[PDB]
Amino acid sequence: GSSGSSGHSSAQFIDSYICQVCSRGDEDDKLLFCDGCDDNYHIFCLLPPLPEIPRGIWRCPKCILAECKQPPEAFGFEQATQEYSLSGPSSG
Ligand SMILES: [Zn+2]
Ligand SMILES: [Zn+2]
């Protein structure tokens, strides 16, 4: 029959990292993380490829090649990070 007003039961958990070029996992040991889409990319899958895991922040080509040159439909205000939980205002 019917119930009225539905749609409120969708759960999913993903705690794994799969490359976006070869679709592997055992290579996670050398998997990189993008600071925009949180993806997984190896050092021998990119182009040009990399020598090994980077130090600072590393980004993927799927994001850089997009932000680099985009059409007139992505102009506005930047995002705003969430507050910080330090637990301990002031100091004296
Ligand atoms: Zn790969
Ligand atoms: Zn990315």
mmCIF file with all atom_site columns, C-alpha atoms and ligand atoms in Angstrom:
data_model
loop_
_atom_site.group_PDB
_atom_site.id
_atom_site.type_symbol
_atom_site.label_atom_id
_atom_site.label_alt_id
_atom_site.label_comp_id
_atom_site.label_asym_id
_atom_site.label_entity_id
_atom_site.label_seq_id
_atom_site.pdbx_PDB_ins_code
_atom_site.Cartn_x
_atom_site.Cartn_y
_atom_site.Cartn_z
_atom_site.occupancy
_atom_site.B_iso_or_equiv
_atom_site.pdbx_formal_charge
_atom_site.auth_seq_id
_atom_site.auth_comp_id
_atom_site.auth_asym_id
_atom_site.auth_atom_id
_atom_site.pdbx_PDB_model_num
ATOM   1  C  CA . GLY A 1 1  ? 0.000  0.000  0.000   1.00 0.00 ? 1  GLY A CA 1
ATOM   2  C  CA . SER A 1 2  ? 1.111  3.538  0.816   1.00 0.00 ? 2  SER A CA 1
ATOM   3  C  CA . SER A 1 3  ? 2.580  5.387  3.798   1.00 0.00 ? 3  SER A CA 1
ATOM   4  C  CA . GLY A 1 4  ? 2.995  9.029  2.826   1.00 0.00 ? 4  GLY A CA 1
ATOM   5  C  CA . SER A 1 5  ? 6.217  11.033 2.722   1.00 0.00 ? 5  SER A CA 1
ATOM   6  C  CA . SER A 1 6  ? 9.040  8.525  2.269   1.00 0.00 ? 6  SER A CA 1
ATOM   7  C  CA . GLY A 1 7  ? 12.759 8.605  1.537   1.00 0.00 ? 7  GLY A CA 1
ATOM   8  C  CA . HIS A 1 8  ? 14.918 8.633  4.661   1.00 0.00 ? 8  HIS A CA 1
ATOM   9  C  CA . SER A 1 9  ? 16.905 5.391  4.782   1.00 0.00 ? 9  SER A CA 1
ATOM   10 C  CA . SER A 1 10 ? 20.240 5.553  2.959   1.00 0.00 ? 10 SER A CA 1
ATOM   11 C  CA . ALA A 1 11 ? 23.441 4.414  4.667   1.00 0.00 ? 11 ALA A CA 1
ATOM   12 C  CA . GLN A 1 12 ? 26.865 3.685  3.179   1.00 0.00 ? 12 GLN A CA 1
ATOM   13 C  CA . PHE A 1 13 ? 30.425 3.235  4.440   1.00 0.00 ? 13 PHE A CA 1
ATOM   14 C  CA . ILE A 1 14 ? 33.633 3.486  2.412   1.00 0.00 ? 14 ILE A CA 1
ATOM   15 C  CA . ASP A 1 15 ? 36.999 3.082  4.135   1.00 0.00 ? 15 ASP A CA 1
ATOM   16 C  CA . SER A 1 16 ? 39.158 2.094  1.164   1.00 0.00 ? 16 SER A CA 1
ATOM   17 C  CA . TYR A 1 17 ? 41.321 3.736  -1.498  1.00 0.00 ? 17 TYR A CA 1
ATOM   18 C  CA . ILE A 1 18 ? 41.225 2.574  -5.118  1.00 0.00 ? 18 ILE A CA 1
ATOM   19 C  CA . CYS A 1 19 ? 43.348 4.109  -7.874  1.00 0.00 ? 19 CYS A CA 1
ATOM   20 C  CA . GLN A 1 20 ? 41.516 6.056  -10.583 1.00 0.00 ? 20 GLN A CA 1
ATOM   21 C  CA . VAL A 1 21 ? 43.759 4.828  -13.398 1.00 0.00 ? 21 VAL A CA 1
ATOM   22 C  CA . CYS A 1 22 ? 44.362 1.110  -12.871 1.00 0.00 ? 22 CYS A CA 1
ATOM   23 C  CA . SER A 1 23 ? 41.762 0.470  -10.169 1.00 0.00 ? 23 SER A CA 1
ATOM   24 C  CA . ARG A 1 24 ? 44.006 -1.273 -7.641  1.00 0.00 ? 24 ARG A CA 1
ATOM   25 C  CA . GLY A 1 25 ? 44.427 -1.419 -3.875  1.00 0.00 ? 25 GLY A CA 1
ATOM   26 C  CA . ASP A 1 26 ? 47.614 -3.274 -2.971  1.00 0.00 ? 26 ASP A CA 1
ATOM   27 C  CA . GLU A 1 27 ? 49.450 -0.298 -4.470  1.00 0.00 ? 27 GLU A CA 1
ATOM   28 C  CA . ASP A 1 28 ? 47.828 1.924  -1.842  1.00 0.00 ? 28 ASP A CA 1
ATOM   29 C  CA . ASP A 1 29 ? 51.260 1.910  -0.200  1.00 0.00 ? 29 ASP A CA 1
ATOM   30 C  CA . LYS A 1 30 ? 52.176 4.535  -2.796  1.00 0.00 ? 30 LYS A CA 1
ATOM   31 C  CA . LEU A 1 31 ? 48.739 6.077  -3.326  1.00 0.00 ? 31 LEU A CA 1
ATOM   32 C  CA . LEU A 1 32 ? 48.376 9.864  -3.403  1.00 0.00 ? 32 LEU A CA 1
ATOM   33 C  CA . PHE A 1 33 ? 45.524 11.953 -2.002  1.00 0.00 ? 33 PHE A CA 1
ATOM   34 C  CA . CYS A 1 34 ? 44.016 14.959 -3.781  1.00 0.00 ? 34 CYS A CA 1
ATOM   35 C  CA . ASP A 1 35 ? 43.301 18.101 -1.761  1.00 0.00 ? 35 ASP A CA 1
ATOM   36 C  CA . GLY A 1 36 ? 40.034 18.739 -3.579  1.00 0.00 ? 36 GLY A CA 1
ATOM   37 C  CA . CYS A 1 37 ? 38.215 15.502 -4.368  1.00 0.00 ? 37 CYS A CA 1
ATOM   38 C  CA . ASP A 1 38 ? 40.060 13.164 -2.000  1.00 0.00 ? 38 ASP A CA 1
ATOM   39 C  CA . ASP A 1 39 ? 40.882 10.666 -4.748  1.00 0.00 ? 39 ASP A CA 1
ATOM   40 C  CA . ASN A 1 40 ? 43.567 7.993  -5.097  1.00 0.00 ? 40 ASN A CA 1
ATOM   41 C  CA . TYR A 1 41 ? 46.337 8.175  -7.696  1.00 0.00 ? 41 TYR A CA 1
ATOM   42 C  CA . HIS A 1 42 ? 49.601 6.241  -7.970  1.00 0.00 ? 42 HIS A CA 1
ATOM   43 C  CA . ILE A 1 43 ? 52.992 7.644  -8.975  1.00 0.00 ? 43 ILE A CA 1
ATOM   44 C  CA . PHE A 1 44 ? 53.292 5.436  -12.059 1.00 0.00 ? 44 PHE A CA 1
ATOM   45 C  CA . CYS A 1 45 ? 49.715 6.017  -13.217 1.00 0.00 ? 45 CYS A CA 1
ATOM   46 C  CA . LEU A 1 46 ? 49.828 9.790  -13.697 1.00 0.00 ? 46 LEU A CA 1
ATOM   47 C  CA . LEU A 1 47 ? 51.242 11.588 -16.735 1.00 0.00 ? 47 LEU A CA 1
ATOM   48 C  CA . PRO A 1 48 ? 53.803 12.701 -16.419 1.00 0.00 ? 48 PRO A CA 1
ATOM   49 C  CA . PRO A 1 49 ? 54.289 10.206 -13.559 1.00 0.00 ? 49 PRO A CA 1
ATOM   50 C  CA . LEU A 1 50 ? 56.003 10.984 -10.253 1.00 0.00 ? 50 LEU A CA 1
ATOM   51 C  CA . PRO A 1 51 ? 59.079 9.493  -8.533  1.00 0.00 ? 51 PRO A CA 1
ATOM   52 C  CA . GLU A 1 52 ? 57.253 8.774  -5.276  1.00 0.00 ? 52 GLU A CA 1
ATOM   53 C  CA . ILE A 1 53 ? 54.774 10.049 -2.689  1.00 0.00 ? 53 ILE A CA 1
ATOM   54 C  CA . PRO A 1 54 ? 54.898 13.866 -2.439  1.00 0.00 ? 54 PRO A CA 1
ATOM   55 C  CA . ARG A 1 55 ? 55.663 15.844 0.718   1.00 0.00 ? 55 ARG A CA 1
ATOM   56 C  CA . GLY A 1 56 ? 53.323 18.813 1.020   1.00 0.00 ? 56 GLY A CA 1
ATOM   57 C  CA . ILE A 1 57 ? 49.843 18.984 -0.482  1.00 0.00 ? 57 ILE A CA 1
ATOM   58 C  CA . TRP A 1 58 ? 49.352 17.079 -3.738  1.00 0.00 ? 58 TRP A CA 1
ATOM   59 C  CA . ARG A 1 59 ? 46.520 17.497 -6.242  1.00 0.00 ? 59 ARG A CA 1
ATOM   60 C  CA . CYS A 1 60 ? 45.203 15.323 -9.073  1.00 0.00 ? 60 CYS A CA 1
ATOM   61 C  CA . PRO A 1 61 ? 45.111 16.169 -12.805 1.00 0.00 ? 61 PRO A CA 1
ATOM   62 C  CA . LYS A 1 62 ? 41.347 15.627 -12.862 1.00 0.00 ? 62 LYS A CA 1
ATOM   63 C  CA . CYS A 1 63 ? 41.007 18.665 -10.600 1.00 0.00 ? 63 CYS A CA 1
ATOM   64 C  CA . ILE A 1 64 ? 43.887 20.844 -11.795 1.00 0.00 ? 64 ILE A CA 1
ATOM   65 C  CA . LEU A 1 65 ? 43.006 20.408 -15.469 1.00 0.00 ? 65 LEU A CA 1
ATOM   66 C  CA . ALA A 1 66 ? 39.491 21.490 -14.503 1.00 0.00 ? 66 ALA A CA 1
ATOM   67 C  CA . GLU A 1 67 ? 40.258 24.506 -12.315 1.00 0.00 ? 67 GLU A CA 1
ATOM   68 C  CA . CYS A 1 68 ? 43.024 25.585 -14.693 1.00 0.00 ? 68 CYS A CA 1
ATOM   69 C  CA . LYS A 1 69 ? 40.607 26.526 -17.476 1.00 0.00 ? 69 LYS A CA 1
ATOM   70 C  CA . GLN A 1 70 ? 36.843 26.493 -16.927 1.00 0.00 ? 70 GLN A CA 1
ATOM   71 C  CA . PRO A 1 71 ? 33.852 28.082 -18.709 1.00 0.00 ? 71 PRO A CA 1
ATOM   72 C  CA . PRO A 1 72 ? 31.866 31.103 -17.450 1.00 0.00 ? 72 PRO A CA 1
ATOM   73 C  CA . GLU A 1 73 ? 29.889 29.347 -14.716 1.00 0.00 ? 73 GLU A CA 1
ATOM   74 C  CA . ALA A 1 74 ? 32.144 29.037 -11.669 1.00 0.00 ? 74 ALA A CA 1
ATOM   75 C  CA . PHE A 1 75 ? 32.433 32.575 -10.302 1.00 0.00 ? 75 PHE A CA 1
ATOM   76 C  CA . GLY A 1 76 ? 31.313 33.555 -6.815  1.00 0.00 ? 76 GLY A CA 1
ATOM   77 C  CA . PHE A 1 77 ? 32.473 33.377 -3.204  1.00 0.00 ? 77 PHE A CA 1
ATOM   78 C  CA . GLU A 1 78 ? 34.983 30.920 -1.745  1.00 0.00 ? 78 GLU A CA 1
ATOM   79 C  CA . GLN A 1 79 ? 34.022 28.328 0.869   1.00 0.00 ? 79 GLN A CA 1
ATOM   80 C  CA . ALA A 1 80 ? 34.303 28.848 4.626   1.00 0.00 ? 80 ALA A CA 1
ATOM   81 C  CA . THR A 1 81 ? 36.072 26.252 6.770   1.00 0.00 ? 81 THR A CA 1
ATOM   82 C  CA . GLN A 1 82 ? 34.320 25.058 9.928   1.00 0.00 ? 82 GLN A CA 1
ATOM   83 C  CA . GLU A 1 83 ? 35.195 26.288 13.418  1.00 0.00 ? 83 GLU A CA 1
ATOM   84 C  CA . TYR A 1 84 ? 38.020 24.662 15.379  1.00 0.00 ? 84 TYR A CA 1
ATOM   85 C  CA . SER A 1 85 ? 37.693 22.602 18.559  1.00 0.00 ? 85 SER A CA 1
ATOM   86 C  CA . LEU A 1 86 ? 40.601 23.446 20.862  1.00 0.00 ? 86 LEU A CA 1
ATOM   87 C  CA . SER A 1 87 ? 38.684 23.314 24.145  1.00 0.00 ? 87 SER A CA 1
ATOM   88 C  CA . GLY A 1 88 ? 40.309 26.108 26.126  1.00 0.00 ? 88 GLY A CA 1
ATOM   89 C  CA . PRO A 1 89 ? 39.551 29.765 25.324  1.00 0.00 ? 89 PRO A CA 1
ATOM   90 C  CA . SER A 1 90 ? 42.097 32.411 26.314  1.00 0.00 ? 90 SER A CA 1
ATOM   91 C  CA . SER A 1 91 ? 45.138 31.622 28.459  1.00 0.00 ? 91 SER A CA 1
ATOM   92 C  CA . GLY A 1 92 ? 46.229 32.987 31.824  1.00 0.00 ? 92 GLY A CA 1
HETATM 93 ZN ZN . ZN  B 2 .  ? 47.186 3.038  -10.331 1.00 0.00 ? 1  ZN  B ZN 1
HETATM 94 ZN ZN . ZN  B 2 .  ? 41.176 15.792 -7.406  1.00 0.00 ? 2  ZN  B ZN 1
#
